[PDB]
Design goal:
Chain C: It comes from Escherichia coli (strain K12). This is part of a larger assembly, with two copies of chain A (53 residues) and one copy of chain C (49 residues). With 53 residues, chain A is an alpha+beta fold. Chain A is 26% helix and 26% strand. Chain A has two helices and four strands, in the order H-E-E-E-E-H. The longest helix of chain A has 7 residues, at 7-13. Chain C has one helix at residues 24-28. The longest helix of chain C is centred in the middle third of the chain and has 5 residues, at 24-28. Chain C is elongated, with a radius of gyration of 23 Å. Chains in contact: A-B, B-C. The A-B interface holds A 17-22, 25, 28 and B 7-15, 25. Chain A binds a DNA duplex (34 and 34 nucleotides) through helix 1.
Chain lengths: 53, 53, 49
DNA sequence: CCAGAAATTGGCACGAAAATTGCAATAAATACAA
DNA sequence: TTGTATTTATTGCAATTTTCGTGCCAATTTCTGG
């Protein structure tokens, strides 16, 4: 929705491509994750929950 | 014995002027160019068999 | 350098062909002792794993 | 100390949502001959 | 003056497979009263 393209194009582009950040080297598919609910009403990613655990 | 293996990133993220900026890694971006010699060989007076090719 | 009390004479073949005979008192006074400093480096990088 | 009770764990299952892969020629703009 | 042949500009839909969270329960480990 943000870049006004199809989900298949987004899926194909972010395949076996890496990104360098001051924190490390991450695959572009590392930033997509599921979620659970939250008492306030929001959502919390599974990566954050794994880090907390 | 041995040595670690690295990976060349495709996109670089850095914090400039207080905001994060993203660019492409210029050391790995593929690029091509048209040979000007054979391209300029396209003479109309030359045989059509070569010209169409 | 340093100022040294020197005599010009042969001494039992120990100054043969530009050799130099040195007193022990020179060593005991640290008159030609030098300091040397060396640098070592360790680099921590980022790998794929 | 013993044995029954209770807490803990992970394999399997269920639907639902999300990610992946097959499909191969056209729309429109522009320059040229009557 | 116009109708037509040639050259840029099009980077999605639709099945299908895979992954998500969470319940059930058999097997295992921990706990507590007489």
């Amino acid at each position: 929705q943000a870049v006004e393209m199809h989900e298949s194009t987004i899926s194909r582009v972010t395949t076996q491509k890496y990104l360098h950040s001051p924190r490390g080297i991450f695959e572009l598919k590392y930033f997509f994750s599921s979620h659970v609910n939250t008492e306030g009403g929001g959502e919390a990613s599974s990566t954050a929950i794994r880090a907390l655990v | 014995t041995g040595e670690p293996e690295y990976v060349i990133p495709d996109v670089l993220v850095r914090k400039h002027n207080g905001h994060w900026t993203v660019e492409l890694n210029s050391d790995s971006i593929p690029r091509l160019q048209i040979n000007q010699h054979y391209a300029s060989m396209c003479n109309n007076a030359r045989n059509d068999g070569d010209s169409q090719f | 350098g340093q100022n040294m009390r020197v005599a010009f004479m042969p001494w039992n073949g120990y100054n043969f062909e530009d050799s130099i005979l040195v007193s022990e008192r020179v060593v005991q006074e640290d008159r030609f002792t030098t300091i040397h400093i060396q640098e070592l480096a360790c680099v921590s990088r980022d790998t794929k794993l």
